[PDB]
């Protein structure tokens, strides 16, 4: 019985691996060998955002490419205006321990969560001038690692209960559950078309889930350790993950196989945050060594290094327009980086 | 562009209000010591947090209590709403002033698991600078278990026979030498784990808990006070 199912699962794993090998004909490294190299890009810190009393654990940019929201372990959600380095809202949190932070595409909401296992959605455009907890989504049996808004009313949250959840904010229930991950789901990236989303967990696997159907289409396993960061390619047919294994890896959804493995012998620290550039040519990865690396997503070359943080780099996000990359670290600081011609 | 100037002035006023509130929050925050309760289910960690809540004013995810001892604020939290995977959510406690590690010294079967847990907490990359207040608990049941019952400790730790009570044992006046030997042995196992690595960065404060609650509060207070003394002396350089 159980032995037969185990053997059948092993046979299916072997068949999937054989199909992936059959698709592997010319690696992305050889395909991009002749392309002109990205060059030595250098980003200077235009604006350092200060005001947090504890370590920044997450941040997320707004669609406006100007307003961001950052979560600190002191129990504070601060919305920053990068253009003027001013704080618009400093929401106190009921639970000090916050590990995820979301900004709605419309700018009318923010979301936070963490060891309280609760997704708190805060309304910003309230009748009064005070930002209040619009809704406290509950139901997760583990710490909330990532929150990503979809359409102002539905939110996808990845948790430490090894499951992700699509919530209806108005009702407050689980519209959909996404099960299958064996470890803690830590990173979450929505597709630009909102139909699909990829989740990186602590089982060294990244799973592509269908939002409206609620099942896992694809499972990608190339990492030797737990994935901390995930980011969709702007095209929507690829995604990059970073692990505590000191590697980032690029996977394609249409080949069901990894394309390139950005790694170096000097890098021993794990990757915490990962995001692409506007065109996907640059892959920005935050590390535990208090540093960030900008790789060529097609060449696996360290195009640049962002070094301004005294503690672990916890989050980094690239604006919607690609204007700047904002990196928040455990030194209670967020730095906005941009390149000068 | 008068409207733009007005909007900028309003933004600056809101920012000033936010900074003032943030300074008040920092006033409350840096004067509060956040202790992290860590232990197994057998250990009376929940009992400890309940007793500390009932003694002072006090205040399912995380069980959090806030209390005042000698006008010094403490914030003790036990993480009980998670799974066994703690390699990711322990990272949230790298700024914690002290980890109160409660151990059940009476149960020898899981004492090795407690030692492993203490070792992993001690040798973490994100807990290298966090001092641990050891809380050997259930001392009365340890006394009852070593006075009689023939539940030998050497079955689980075959170094008990090759172990002598330390000269600096300062035990209770009525303690049987056997119970002093056992309690020490456990304390020295944890202390060997502590002094194996990271002695300079952080230190362990053994305490034989399950005594009167006031003694536990007082030991936590004194341990926290030095910890702050070490930190401030490292910052000043008089170390």
């Amino acid at each position, epitope marked *: 019985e159980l032995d037969q199912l185990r053997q059948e699962a092993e046979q299916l794993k072997n068949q999937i691996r054989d199909a992936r090998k059959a698709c592997a004909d010319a690696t992305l490294s050889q395909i991009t060998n002749n392309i002109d190299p990205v060059g030595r890009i250098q980003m200077r810190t235009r604006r350092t955002l200060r005001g947090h009393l504890a370590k920044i654990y997450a941040m997320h940019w707004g669609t406006d490419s100007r307003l961001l929201v950052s979560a600190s372990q002191d129990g504070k959600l601060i919305i920053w205006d990068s253009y003027t380095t001013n704080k618009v809202h400093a929401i106190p949190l009921r639970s000090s321990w916050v590990m995820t932070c979301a900004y709605a595409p419309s700018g009318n909401y923010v979301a936070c969560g963490g060891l309280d296992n609760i997704c708190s959605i805060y309304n910003l455009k309230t009748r009064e001038g005070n930002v209040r907890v619009s809704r406290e989504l509950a139901g997760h049996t583990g710490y909330l690692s990532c929150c990503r808004f979809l359409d102002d009313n539905q939110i996808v949250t990845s948790s430490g209960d090894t499951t992700c959840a699509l919530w209806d904010i108005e009702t407050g229930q689980q519209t959909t559950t996404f099960t299958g991950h064996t470890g803690d789901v830590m990173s979450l990236s929505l597709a630009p078309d909102t139909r699909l989303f990829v989740s990186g967990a*602590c089982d*060294a696997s990244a799973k592509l889930w269908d939002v409206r159907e609620g099942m896992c289409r694809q499972t990608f396993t190339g990492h030797e350790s737990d994935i901390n960061a995930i980011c969709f390619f702007p095209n929507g047919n690829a995604f990059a993950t970073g692990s505590d*294994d000191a590697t980032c890896r690029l996977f394609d959804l249409r080949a069901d196989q990894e394309l390139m493995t950005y790694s170096h012998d000097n890098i021993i620290c794990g990757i915490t945050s990962v995001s692409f550039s506007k065109s996907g040519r640059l892959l920005l990865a935050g590390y535990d060594d208090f540093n960030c690396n900008v790789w060529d997503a097609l060449k696996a070359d360290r195009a640049g290094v962002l070094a301004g943080h005294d503690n672990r780099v916890s989050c980094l996000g690239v604006t919607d327009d690609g204007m700047a990359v904002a990196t928040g670290s455990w030194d209670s600081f967020l730095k906005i980086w941009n390149g000068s011609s | 562009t008068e409207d733009q100037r007005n909007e900028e002035k309003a933004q600056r006023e809101a920012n000033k209000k936010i900074e003032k509130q943030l300074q008040k929050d920092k006033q409350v925050y840096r004067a509060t010591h956040r202790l992290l309760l860590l232990g197994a289910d057998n250990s009376g960690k929940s009992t400890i947090v309940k007793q500390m809540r009932i003694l002072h004013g006090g205040s399912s995810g995380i069980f959090e209590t806030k209390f005042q001892v000698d006008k010094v604020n403490f914030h003790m939290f036990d993480v009980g709403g998670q*799974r*066994d995977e703690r390699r990711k959510w322990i990272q949230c406690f790298n700024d914690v002033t002290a980890i109160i590690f409660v151990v059940d010294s009476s149960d020898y079967n899981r004492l090795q*698991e407690a030692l492993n847990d203490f070792k*992993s907490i001690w040798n*973490n990359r994100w807990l290298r600078t966090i001092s641990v207040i050891l809380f050997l608990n259930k001392q009365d049941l340890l006394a009852e278990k070593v006075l009689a019952g023939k539940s030998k400790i050497e079955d689980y730790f075959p170094e008990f026979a090759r172990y002598t009570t330390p000269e600096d044992a300062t035990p209770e006046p009525g303690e049987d030498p056997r119970v002093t030997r056992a309690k020490y042995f456990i304390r020295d196992e944890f202390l060997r784990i502590s002094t194996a690595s990271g002695d300079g960065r952080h230190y362990c404060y053994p305490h034989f808990t399950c005594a009167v609650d006031t003694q536990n509060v007082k030991f936590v207070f004194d341990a926290v006070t030095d910890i702050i003394i070490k930190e401030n002396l490292k910052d000043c350089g008089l170390f």
Partner: nanobody
Amino acid sequence: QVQLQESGGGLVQPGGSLRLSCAASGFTFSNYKMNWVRQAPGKGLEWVSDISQSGASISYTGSVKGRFTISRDNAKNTLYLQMNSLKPEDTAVYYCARCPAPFTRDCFDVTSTTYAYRGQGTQVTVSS
């Protein structure tokens, strides 16, 4: 994909010797500290032994100290545990649990109920 397929294990009379060999594939063996953990019937997962990245730091639980000797062959990407003078309290399922992160000395999620970097294990039944 990370795989840690254990081997060995069977019916052994008390006092006998075994050698469990865990073959590891999908990750660089040398960079990861490893640890043999056992689950006895009607009991939780208990850590038995651990090996550092090369072999400098080797530790055993007290109940198996001297009896078991654990070694690592990096070239073959295998981890062995040698059982000597078995006792009936050792009847358990043995798993080769890899420490979650490379290049470190703290291993947290080993011996957890659901750990992603251990194998199915082998059944060792020390009985007569």
